[PDB]
């Protein structure tokens with residue numbers, strides 16, 4: 208096919224920027240710090256469960272919420288023997304506490320019967336609960352967003368919401384139940400891929416990776432939004448053979464396009480690149496948390512990867528910062544290995560863009576430890592703070608199902624300094640496992 212150029216009015220993780228990362232990531236400024244394995248404990252209240260992807264109850268601006276004197280963290284958890292066993296649990300600590308042992312376990316957010324009682328057609332076919340966010344409303348309610356995964360329908364993923372009813376006393380929190388439990392968005396075909404388009408390809412046998420998950424709630428000027436992991440649809444630069452000739456996905460120059468595109472077309476990664484159309488999508492919600500407006504993606508990753516996860520966005524000191532986690536094993540970029548794991552980041556003067564790369568390339572964090580390493584971390588998440596130039600990076604530690612005595616747990620948190628369009632890991636800033644704030 209003939210070369211063309213089309214941005215679709217959105218930002219892009221370009222091949223040229225990603226190719227700069229292999230050399231850049233040797234700089235300790237952009238490296239997840241080494242952790243000390245002999246300080247690492249299992250979450251004592253989680254009782255033999257793997258606990259991975261986690262997120263704090265957040266205020267509208269992303270700072271950590273105070274629920275009746277408690278911090279609350281939602282986390283995926285399940286049997287280490289069963290990789291398809293995933294439910295959201297709610298942990299909580301008193302404000303002031305920092306030890307991993309301070310985290311009590313209120314149990315699952317949902318009963319099995321909740322999805323049926325919701326009178327929601329998609330929800331009644333759910334088989335797993337995957338990641339999202341949680342915001343603390345102005346009328347004092349815990350408002351959860353998460354991913355409804357259905358294994359019965361070829362891995363359908365649906366952005367979902369519920370209010371979690373929680374009684375608070377001097378000693379404990381107790382989940383009483385949920386309400387307003389409903390599907391919000393399952394893709395539209397034109398902006399964000401839906402599950403039927405995945406099935407059109409031949410589902411899992413095709414090599415395609417359909418995502419519509421990890422919704423993150425944020426507000427600006429009283430407007431409510433979710434920003435989430437997705438994939439592009441037919442009208443904002445879809446996957447396919449033709450996608451490899453779109454110079455917007457390469458950047459730099461036409462000379463770089465010709466060279467990189469012909470290399471890619473001759474490589475064993477041609478098909479992978481064709482299928483790769485990850486996106487950080489966006490929708491506006493109404494005041495009852497239903498869908499107001501499908502919006503254009505903030506950024507896309509055509510040709511480089513199909514999987515940019517754990518969308519996160521917030522305002523900090525007059526600028527908007529947009530983050531995503533991604534595995535080098537699923538990328539098509541020379542020099543990036545299957546061991547490499549990233550938090551990528553971008554910056555704008557507005558929530559809705561346009562976003563340009565942090566640290567010139569997109570690199571913020573790199574982690575490349577062996578999957579077998581007990582101190583392996585993934586799912587890095589920047590928790591904004593009330594004031595200052597630091598955010599707190601949370602992550603989970605130790606791969607799921609790897610070790611009988613060492614489960615997936617809260618990683619030691621650490622600090623990331625952010626100023627303008629640059630970031631750096633703060634020297635020797637390792638905090639307690641699962642610590643959410645600098646202030647104690």
Ligand SMILES: OC[C@H]1O[C@@](CO)(O[C@H]2O[C@H](CO)[C@@H](O)[C@H](O)[C@H]2O)[C@@H](O)[C@@H]1O
Pocket residue numbers: 260283293337338339354420421436514516517534585586
């Ligand atoms: O467990 C699902 C949950 O984990 C995340 C990020 O850790 O994605 C993981 O699981 C996906 C489905 O198995 C994989 O495709 C991905 O490589 C892995 O990181 C979230 O995106 C998801 O909600």
Ligand SMILES: [Ca+2]
Pocket residue numbers: 415416417438446482483484485513
């Ligand atoms: Ca795809």
